């Protein structure tokens, strides 16, 4: 039984991961009211 | 999920037409242009003209 | 008595350049060793 045994600190084992995408990209956030979604383009081309 | 009348569609292809067209003729006016300060010449030639 | 201490250290951090490509069997004008440095830098569990 007489151990006497003392904890120093510990770790934390953190990870080297950033956004960068939805941070500099996908800035704008939309939330959905329906199931599917459209995303729509207007190809123009006068003459 | 919004939807219009048609007739605000028909305004919403009247301002777009306005604007393609505008966009038409600045296109098409820089042809001369380009024809006069690419050649020192220039032809003003085309159909229904 | 021999007390053995395993600080914690992972092999990943213990490279040794063996092999055919460690410093001398390049040529030091057209080498740059920043690449190993990225490279082994990797693995270091916070800032160096």
Same mark, same amino acid.
């Given at each position: 039984? &007489?151990?006497?045994?003392? !904890? ?15 941070? !500099? ?12 979604? &459209? !995303?729509?383009?207007?190809?123009? !081309?006068?003459? | ?49 | 008595?021999?007390?053995? $201490? ?8 213990? @490279? #040794?350049?063996?092999?055919? #490509?460690?410093?001398?069997?390049? /040529?030091?004008? #057209?080498? /740059?060793? #920043? /690449? /190993? @440095? ?8 916070? $800032? $160096?």
């Amino acid at each position: 039984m &007489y151990t006497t045994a003392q !904890l120093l600190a510990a770790n934390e084992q953190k990870f080297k991961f950033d956004p960068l995408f939805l941070r !500099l990209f996908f800035r704008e956030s939309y939330p959905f009211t329906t199931e599917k979604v &459209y !995303l729509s383009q207007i190809p123009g !081309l006068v003459n | 999920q919004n939807l219009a009348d048609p007739a605000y569609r028909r305004r919403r292809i009247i301002m777009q037409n306005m604007r393609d067209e505008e966009l038409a003729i600045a296109q098409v006016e820089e042809m001369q242009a380009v024809s006069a300060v690419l050649k020192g010449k220039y032809t003003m030639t085309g159909e229904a003209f | 008595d021999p007390v053995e $201490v395993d600080m914690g250290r992972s092999e990943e951090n213990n @490279i #040794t350049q063996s092999g055919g #490509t460690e410093w001398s069997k390049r /040529d030091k004008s #057209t080498y /740059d060793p #920043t /690449d /190993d @440095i990225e490279a082994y830098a990797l693995n270091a569990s916070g $800032v $160096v």
